[PDB]
Ligand binder design. Structure first.
Ligand SMILES: CC(C)(COP(=O)(O)OP(=O)(O)OC[C@H]1O[C@@H](n2cnc3c(N)ncnc32)[C@H](O)[C@@H]1OP(=O)(O)O)[C@@H](O)C(=O)NCCC(=O)NCCS
Length: 589
């Protein structure tokens, strides 16, 4: 590759930044202790320098010194069930399917789109991406695109495994009524016609309606905790017939889920709930297989989108792919490719036992908990967007990040360690690092705005606001150029772990542990289309906030858990609105 390698920030720089990031987020006493702990860790000839040298050696010996640690720490090691906790969802615009054939026509076209997109990929014909927004123009890593259809996430007892692929024939798994069918799409590079795909889908729907053939909803098992699924899967593996079906799923291109009519109204919020967890076993919750990277949902009632397994790639790459797919569906149906004789799709067989029956019950129950615990809302701020923000000589993203801090503070009376996905695709195999938005400058601003007794003059609030945005931007530039701290500290941490299972004080420190519990987890997932991305929180008492800034509006997808009496997605969305209004008034002085 011609891309530069992810940089290794200097040790002292990361340590200084770290302490500064956390001083206002911990007690004075605790900070003093951390100061001393860090001083000792990074002292000349100390442990810090020994680990740093080992990191430089690792940087030289690998293409990306953090890929492995990051992949495990961020996803594979996580034991939580994938739905809501990990797998984000992208919702397409509302569709209208008068008859079942309309649904199947859409699905056929979509599958065709997928096939031509994958052809462009297999031929390395996809135009190399370039940075836009902050520091734009340089080439970006394209590795993520190659993980779109060739990946499967295997459950494990303690750590999962991301399997990187091509089966011939090449096929897609179609799920209907919780039944999984193998739909071959490419014989000898012969790509079935959009007309033949329609015909095959009609057959699938028909078979998926046969009572005497209906099999147990095995898909449900993949919606459980990772350790739980790993165990139920071990039970399944005992039988040869199940071993075959799993493999088929494991080697498919993707899944195409023909969801049953949802029960509630088709609002952006409800359509997203369906994409996130399917609404539980009583709805479309089992018509899935979360281990597979991409699950395209085409429901009978018009609810469409794609459920994504996070570990193999991030939302930007995903959105580019989907927007291309949808654009391809806007583009005219080509000439035909006709298949005579056209074999019938194969239904994956499962040999269930009393054991598996119990596992299905548990998973059904576990999933229901996720469904009722998710507090989600799609909020569209329409007073203004990027256009107005740019007129304030401000970075939209930074401005929005600051708005979220103010919303959080005005509602809960404190700032908390916050996470914002910062793409580092400027470097080989680059995924993301973290932008810590809960800066000291943000604190000074939110306090001025909310502390009535201080009576801070509006002119001063404006100054603090601009400084907060300046600091947000500075950290953003720092992160996207690989000079931030999270990935750096992670590497040092795991390198030490290799030396001795007993981590240094540095990483046992309550300050470090606290710095990584992201009560406010966020990310910008911009899209030109009518679509939007959403996901749940990463901690029991936290929020998930994915926004899409447009010229005149800003879409906010807010999530939290009903279990935490302290959080509330409706209240937070309201606080976001008020925060944006307040900031607007401040800039209009
Ligand atoms: C960190 C990050 C979010 C910053 O986003 P960004 O796109 O640079 O956003 P900004 O808010 O700075 O906005 C960029 C736009 O505002 C403009 N802008 C930025 N600062 C400005 C300023 N001070 N004054 C006026 N305009 C400004 C830019 O010129 C650009 O305008 P353009 O639409 O004509 O190109 C981005 O670099 C990133 O990493 N995005 C990836 C998110 C991701 O990974 N999502 C999936 C997670 S799994």
């Amino acid at each position: 590759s011609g891309l530069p390698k992810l940089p290794v920030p200097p040790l002292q720089q990361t340590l200084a930044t770290y302490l500064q990031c956390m001083r206002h987020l911990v007690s004075e006493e605790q900070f003093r202790k951390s100061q001393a702990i860090v001083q000792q860790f990074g002292a000349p000839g100390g442990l810090g320098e020994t680990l740093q040298q080992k990191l430089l050696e690792r940087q030289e010996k690998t293409a990306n010194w953090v890929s492995e640690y990051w992949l495990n720490d961020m996803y594979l090691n996580n034991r939580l069930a994938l739905p809501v906790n990990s797998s984000p969802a992208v919702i397409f615009a509302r569709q209208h399917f008068p008859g079942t054939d309309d649904q199947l026509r859409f699905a056929a076209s979509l599958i065709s789109g997928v096939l031509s997109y994958k052809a462009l990929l297999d031929s390395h014909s996809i135009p190399t991406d370039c940075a836009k927004g902050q520091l734009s123009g340089q080439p970006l890593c394209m590795k993520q695109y190659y993980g779109l259809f060739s990946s499967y996430r295997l459950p494990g007892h303690t750590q999962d495994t991301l399997v990187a692929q091509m089966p011939e024939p090449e096929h897609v798994i179609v799920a209907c009524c919780n039944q999984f069918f193998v739909l071959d799409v490419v014989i000898n590079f012969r790509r079935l016609s959009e007309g033949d795909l329609f015909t095959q889908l009609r057959k699938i729907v028909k078979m998926a309606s046969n009572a005497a053939a209906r099999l147990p909803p095995i898909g449900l098992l993949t919606s459980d905790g990772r350790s739980e699924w790993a165990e139920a899967r071990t039970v399944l593996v005992k039988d040869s017939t199940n071993r075959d079906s799993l493999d088929m799923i494991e080697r498919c291109i993707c899944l195409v889920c023909l969801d049953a009519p949802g029960g509630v109204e088709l609002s952006d919020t409800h359509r997203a709930l369906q994409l996130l967890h399917g609404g539980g076993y009583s709805k479309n919750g089992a018509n899935r297989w979360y281990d597979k990277s991409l699950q395209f949902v085409v429901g009978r009632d018009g609810t469409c989108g794609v459920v994504c397994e996070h570990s193999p790639f991030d939302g930007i790459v995903l959105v580019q792919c989907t927007e291309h797919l949808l654009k391809h569906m806007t583009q005219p149906e080509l000439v035909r490719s006709p298949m005579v004789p056209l074999p019938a799709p194969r239904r994956l067989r499962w040999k269930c036992s009393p054991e598996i029956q119990g596992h299905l019950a548990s998973s059904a129950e576990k999933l229901q908990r996720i469904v009722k615990n998710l507090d989600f809302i799609v909020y569209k701020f329409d007073n203004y967007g990027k256009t107005f923000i740019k007129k304030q000589k401000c970075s939209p993203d930074a401005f929005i990040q600051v708005a979220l801090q103010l919303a959080f503070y005005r509602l809960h009376r404190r700032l908390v360690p916050t996470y914002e996905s910062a793409s580092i695709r400027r470097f080989q195999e680059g995924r993301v690092d973290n932008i810590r938005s809960a800066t000291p400058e943000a604190l000074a601003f939110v306090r001025a705005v909310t502390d009535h007794k201080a009576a801070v003059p509006a002119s001063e609030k404006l100054l603090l606001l601009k400084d907060a945005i300046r600091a947000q931007t500075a950290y953003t530039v720092m992160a996207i150029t690989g000079m931030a701290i999270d990935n750096h500290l992670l590497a040092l941490r795991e390198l030490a772990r290799a030396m001795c299972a007993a981590l240094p004080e540095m990483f046992m420190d309550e300050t470090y542990l606290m710095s990584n519990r992201f009560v406010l987890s966020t990310s910008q997932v911009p899209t030109t289309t009518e679509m939007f991305c959403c996901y749940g929180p990463v901690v029991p008492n936290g929020y998930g906030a994915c926004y899409n800034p447009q010229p005149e509006t800003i879409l906010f997808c807010i999530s939290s858990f009903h279990s935490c009496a302290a959080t509330s997605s409706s209240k937070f969305a309201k606080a976001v609105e008020e925060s944006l209004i307040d900031m607007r008034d401040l800039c209009s002085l």
